[PDB]
Design a binder for this molecule. Structure first.
Ligand SMILES: O=C(NCC1=CC1)c1ccc2[nH]c(Nc3cc(CN4CCN(C(=O)CC(F)(F)F)CC4)ccn3)nc2c1
Ligand SMILES: O=C(NCC1=CC1)c1ccc2[nH]c(Nc3cc(CN4CCN(C(=O)CC(F)(F)F)CC4)ccn3)nc2c1
Lengths: 628, 628
């Protein structure tokens, strides 16, 4: 139907993307080439119209080019309305706000995707700072996303510099709600929003006429608390200076992210960081590499963030901070074999590690099995009301919960599959410790056999001599007798290491769940049914009203949305969770029996060294008698 | 707009799925529940209308229920036209024909997906045979697909039994073109179509008035050839009794599939199988499990199909058929350690193996490095004609080629990453062979030291005796001297096994490509751009004509379709292929240097056994002298 146009570009008023106060962004094309661009047709531009100041201004933003900033190609004039149009690069993937709309990110972005957001935001914001222009309005809605040539997302900035001639209410600064601190505030609110999937400070009702509580929360700013939420109407505020349990981020990352957000979120410029302090600590986090470590003792996977130039001493220290294992007790296993790490080895030369192929950690000291620690979340109540707005928010909520449960279910299967490997390697690795003890026993056996034979031969060939021989003959029997006790007790350990020897890993190949069950795929099917319904309810909300036929379809599917969710949740707790807790219960059992056998094998091996020094004082005794 | 209806169901004439001769399939809903169903409204049903025969007939097909057969729920009558309507289950995923439309399957379905098709088709066709009804018209267009609760596809049959009151031209039987053999013919044409992505017998022009050549090809039926294609107009026919190189299937599967298709594709019922012979051999293939084996010698991955009750002897034989390695020369490695397999061990108890974590095979005998063998396919010419039909076929073709190149590029990266592991394990596994040779040397050293000491002591304490001692003293030096040669030559092997010792795997961590390069992700980006354009050209073909604006957009994108393809192909050959061939060239080098060191370590170890029997004839000689 009706559609605006320009000398070089044209678009339809239907194709609408963003609706701002001063302008509107449409999907447009170039009349000649046909490439897609973003058209910013300015609305209500008369009482200003500074064709002198804005001329050089937009020419300055024109040549401004960066990978983390939306490029402004040209400033043209509309054909009819003569409105000045900005031609920008079209960002096919929407904004960060669109990503947070996704239920998969209802409880926070994936850790990898979160690192992309943090890096691009800092790089773009730092590029704007070097030019002096201040933003203050940074929000996931004005942070666009594109797909780079390598497939990884790339985030860019755009809606800035409009405060010359003229923050979002949830991203406003306490003193600015009614200095460069106003910048970092919205940034921290944004970063918390990408990690948690929710806003830092939330009243019970929300941002409305009852948002009076909010201003008290923001002005409260207690200590280095990063969030504060009241769970009841006009009730107390639940404060916390740490991340929620539902956060999809790894524990190692939260330790580094918590201080950053705590120092940039407060009204006082006294303790608040500057752009240099912020850029210093943030870029420090980005430069670090990833170390994947699975602690068999606790059945917990860990991601330790270390710089590439650091040594293995700082590595053991950070591992202690997360696993609570003494640096001298941390023992590493990789690809079926143990790996010895020098205290001064750089992180650049570490082996290749992934979350599905990490470095296992075994400890001499007993440690409790913790397992995965996640937030148990149930389904919300589904009201029969036809409210399109309510059915849309209810769709995002109920689907995000199932996304989390499926995310946890995917993590539970990983822990079990990693456990089965870490055990299969350990039993074969401790078996190698048994193979070397046999070698050290044969050294004492060969030493025993020949040394005693010479002294038992010396009596057959060639009061005084008899007294010496007897004392020696007894001593040789003191050790050969204990040599027979160890010889048979090791066959008992070998009987334990043998299949069916009460230490086998057969239990682990039975109790838990396996990728053969396809429990994660089963949950993803129902989750797709719900996700399709969610994006459909968004489409019905945009229309504000539906026809009669569309009205009852919306109600039928809304009833199937509940049935899909319950069917998955039941399959999640009655199959995945229960079979995991049974695999974790029998996991403690085998740990006790393994550490017990490892303590026995230790002593029996050290006893071979205890008798190794005793046979060196006798083989060199009579055989080395002195005479002219 | 206009839309038919029924007592219990209603649908729009816009929502159309399949267009047949006797009926039309629409997307319909149930008036009460709102669940989706397939509506088969019969067109032109007057000169027949057997409400006596079809009544009991459709009631028989009603109760007919199977997992591999489209369920017929009810037979109702249209409101206005009074046409008899069939209510069937809606299959959301289309037909097998729709899957083959996808460029990813232009050269054949994935191996896993192919096994699903074969199993479901046989199960459904066997269920129809047990009821006596014959099909003859089996085609990927009448084989629907659904997604099961576990996420895996499920294929079902439908368009059968319509030959009572009344084969596709490309699926027709030679004698039926102008017995139960007419069945298996279309089945074989279907199975070849799913593996290759193309039809078995193809004239140059195609199925037209020049299809006269086709009938000569079908009636030719030379031997057990499964395909025959002329590459030039009215030219000779290129016959082949094997699968094409572009086939995505594994070599082990082709060996089993080739005889099946060859015996069911011929006009003669003399050599053609029956439904029992077909069901016997097919079900035999489905019952077998998968054994993933990566031969480091040839740098080739293999999938050996074996029944679970078979022994490791049949396993070595099949491995010999693919890798050409003698059963006694096949040596297995798994998870960093070698694994010894008893000749009678069942396949049920084999370790867990995947294509990304297989069982490596090393051989004593030298073998050439073959690498991946794939079909080099270039891009086709893009004509400037506006033909919507031509732009659609050209889109499927050019995108399928890039899908193949990206598939190969994904396989090349796997081979390299598997190679790096298989080498890192081997160097540490042969290092263990060096650790046990040190142990066997210390056994001869301890034997040497004490045995010679007793004879060098016997001369200090206690013509005839001197003659014996001297001959013994020399003999002890004959072995201790060679014991010094081996001792130092092993340190040279240890110098080779040490980092930088000319045998290190540092070259492999440099020459080839890595997942860090994200070369597969780079190709997938451009491949999505092309796939989106392809499905758009399908949409433009369905309209038969486009508006002026849609007309030039179709031409702009058609020009970008070529630029995307060339950009990927250049990045495929100039980055992925070249860096792979360089990794394969230096792969031969390290193989020669590894097998050379393995031959040295062998002899030096056997020499310790050669001197182990020499020191047993001397330590028991003088020390065991006889006297009263
Ligand atoms: O505000 C901006 N600058 C202000 C400044 C001072 C500087 C700005 C600038 C650049 C942008 N690039 C975009 N891309 C975008 C893309 C989508 C996704 N979407 C794209 C294609 N789809 C359609 O077209 C649908 C229809 F209806 F059109 F057919 C479907 C999905 C959604 C929202 N945005 N938004 C931008 C906003
Ligand atoms: O011939 C049959 N029986 C003959 C017999 C004697 C017995 C038969 C029987 C059952 C079937 N189930 C289907 N499903 C189906 C589904 C699609 C995919 N598709 C579905 C939903 N989409 C639309 O609806 C588009 C629109 F336009 F509708 F909005 C979009 C994509 C395409 C084709 N088919 N086909 C069937 C055919």
């Amino acid at each position: 139907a009706m559609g605006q146009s320009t000398s070089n570009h044209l678009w339809l008023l239907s194709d609408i993307l963003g609706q701002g106060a001063t302008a509107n962004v449409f999907r447009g094309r170039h009349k000649k080439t046909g490439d897609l661009f973003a058209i910013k047709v300015f609305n209500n531009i008369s009482f200003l119209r500074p064709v002198d100041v804005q001329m050089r201004e937009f020419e300055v933003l024109k040549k401004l080019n960066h990978k983390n900033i939306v490029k402004l190609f040209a400033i043209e004039e509309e054909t009819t309305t003569r409105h000045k149009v900005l031609i920008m690069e079209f960002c096919p993937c929407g904004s960060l706000y669109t990503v947070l709309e996704e239920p998969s990110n209802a409880y926070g972005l994936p850790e990898s995707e979160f690192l992309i957001v943090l890096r691009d935001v800092v790089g773009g914001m730092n590029h704007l700072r070097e030019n002096g222009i201040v933003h203050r309005d940074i929000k996931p809605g004005n942070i666009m996303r594109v797909i780079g040539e390598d497939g990884q997302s790339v985030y860019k900035l755009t809606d800035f510099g409009a405060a010359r001639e003229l923050g979002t209410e949830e991203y406003l600064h306490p003193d600015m709600y009614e200095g460069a601190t106003v910048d970092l505030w919205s940034i921290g609110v944004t970063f918390y929003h990408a990690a948690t999937g929710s806003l830092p400070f939330r009243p019970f009702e929300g941002p409305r006429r009852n948002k009076e509580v909010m201003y008290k929360i923001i002005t409260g700013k207690p200590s280095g608390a990063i969030s504060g939420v009241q769970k009841a109407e006009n009730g107390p505020i639940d404060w916390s200076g740490d991340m929620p349990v539902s956060c999809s981020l790894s524990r190692g990352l939260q330790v580094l992210l918590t201080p950053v957000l705590a120092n940039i979120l407060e009204a006082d410029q006294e303790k608040c960081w500057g752009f240099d302090q912020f850029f210093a600590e943030t870029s420090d986090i980005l430069h670090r590499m990833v170390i994947h470590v699975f602690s068999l003792q606790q059945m917990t996977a860990h991601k330790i963030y270390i710089h590439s130039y650091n040594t293995a001493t700082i590595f053991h220290e950070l591992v202690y901070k997360q696993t609570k294992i003494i640096s001298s007790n941390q023992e590493l296993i990789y690809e079926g074999r143990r790996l010895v790490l020098e205290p001064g080895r750089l992180a650049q030369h570490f082996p290749k590690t992934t979350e599905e192929n990490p470095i296992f950690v075994v400890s001499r000291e007993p440690l409790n099995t913790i397992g995965l620690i996640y937030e148990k979340i149930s389904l919300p109540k589904v009201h029969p009301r036809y409210d399109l707005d309510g059915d849309a928010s209810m769709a995002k909520a109920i689907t995000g919960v199932v996304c989390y449960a499926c995310r946890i279910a995917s993590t539970l299967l990983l822990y079990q599959e990693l456990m089965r490997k870490g055990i299969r390697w350990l039993i074969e690795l401790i078996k190698d410790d048994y193979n070397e003890t046999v070698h050290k026993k044969t050294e004492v056996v060969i030493t025993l056999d020949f040394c005693i034979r010479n002294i038992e031969k010396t009596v057959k060939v060639y009061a005084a001599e008899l007294g010496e021989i007897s004392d020696i003959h007894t001593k040789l029997l003191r050790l050969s007798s204990s040599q027979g006790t160890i010889e048979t007790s090791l066959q008992d350990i070998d009987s334990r290491l043998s299949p069916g020897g009460s230490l086998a890993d057969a239990w682990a190949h039975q109790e838990g769940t396996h990728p053969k069950d396809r429990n994660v795929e089963k949950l993803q099917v129902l989750l797709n049914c719900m996700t399709e319904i969610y994006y459909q309810f968004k489409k019905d909300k945009a229309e504000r009203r539906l026809a009669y036929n569309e009205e009852q379809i919306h109600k039928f599917d809304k009833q199937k949305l509940y049935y899909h969710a319950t069917k998955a949740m039941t399959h999640f707790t009655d199959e995945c969770v229960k079979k995991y807790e049974a695999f974790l219960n029998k996991s403690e059992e085998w740990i006790r029996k393994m550490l017990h056998l490892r303590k026995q094998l230790l002593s029996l091996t050290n006893q071979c060294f205890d008798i190794e020094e005793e046979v060196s004082k006798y083989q060199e005794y009579t055989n080395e008698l002195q005479e002219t």
